Write a protein that binds this ligand. Structure first.
Ligand SMILES: Cc1ccc(NC(=O)c2cccc(C(F)(F)F)c2)cc1-c1ccc2c(c1)[nH]c(=O)n2C
Length: 257
């Protein structure tokens, strides 16, 4: 009846520092092979740091799905640490905007389908991601989407009610962020690339004066995908579909290719 989440003491090792994440540092490590380890640098955590760790473990431990980054376990001795699978590859952001990988339409639609599958799973478990974006979508072996929270470089994916600010976060604000990921996949670009001012973007998206230019979608982008993108991006949160409907739309347009 137990999940045995707590990793035995003196087993995890960490190597290369790969980044920063929420409460600490992310390393490539070893625990029954390659793993990613998010570890608190200090030995004595503040009650807040400990609470942030417990909340993150509580969310991750409820997930078991191929499209969610695999949570493996946690340790509190000698330091607070969360262990996940190690993914070989790059995030969708890195692919589209750094190394500019050119995916075929069938593969772009499949990345969208798998992300919607993972998001539908999280929402069914009442988990609102709050920071869905292409950098939080990992292409494991550059084939399987793994949603995680790897990391303000998140305004482009922010729903207008989240920009405006209370609790503006909902399943619908995650749907909007997914709409932006759909825009990235179908255009190969980040929205608002011709606006060099962050304050203006924040202000205008929040007022509904500015929205992504859907005419930028590739020519081989199906019409139903463009319509789905438009629905996910609705300025009013109540007008946006939820992931079971988004999933059904993607599955159908993928069969019609
Ligand atoms: C090691 C580690 C521990 C915890 C998390 N925590 C999440 O992923 C997360 C937190 C809350 C909710 C959710 C979700 F999505 F379920 F809602 C996910 C991420 C990492 C992690 C893994 C790989 C990484 C990395 C960090 N940074 C990096 O560059 N690589 C390549």
């Amino acid at each position: 009846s137990s999940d045995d989440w707590e990793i035995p003491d003196g087993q995890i090792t960490v190597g290369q520092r790969i980044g920063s994440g929420s409460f600490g540092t992310v390393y490539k490590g070893k625990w029954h092979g390659d793993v990613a380890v998010k570890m608190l640098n200090v030995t004595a955590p503040t009650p807040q740091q400990l609470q942030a760790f417990k909340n993150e473990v509580g969310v991750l431990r409820k997930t078991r799905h191929v499209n969610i980054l695999l949570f493996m376990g946690y340790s509190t001795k000698p330091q607070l640490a969360i262990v996940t699978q190690w993914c070989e590859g790059s995030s969708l952001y890195h692919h589209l905007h750094i190394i500019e990988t050119k995916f075929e339409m069938i593969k772009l639609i499949d990345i969208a389908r798998q992300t919607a599958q993972g998001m539908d799973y999280l929402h069914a478990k009442s988990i609102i991601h709050r920071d869905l974006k292409s950098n939080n979508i990992f292409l494991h072996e550059d084939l399987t989407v793994k949603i995680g929270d790897f990391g303000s470089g998140s305004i482009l994916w922010m729903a207008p009610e989240v920009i405006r600010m209370k609790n503006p976060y909902s399943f619908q604000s995650d749907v909007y962020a997914f709409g932006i990921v759909l825009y990235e996949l179908m255009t190969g670009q980040l929205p608002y690339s011709n606006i060099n001012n962050r304050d203006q973007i924040i202000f205008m998206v929040g007022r509904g004066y500015l929205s992504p230019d859907l005419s930028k979608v590739r020519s081989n982008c199906p019409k139903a995908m463009k319509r789905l993108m438009a629905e996910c991006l609705k300025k009013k949160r109540d007008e946006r579909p939820l992931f079971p409907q988004i999933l059904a739309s993607i599955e159908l347009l993928a069969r019609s290719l």
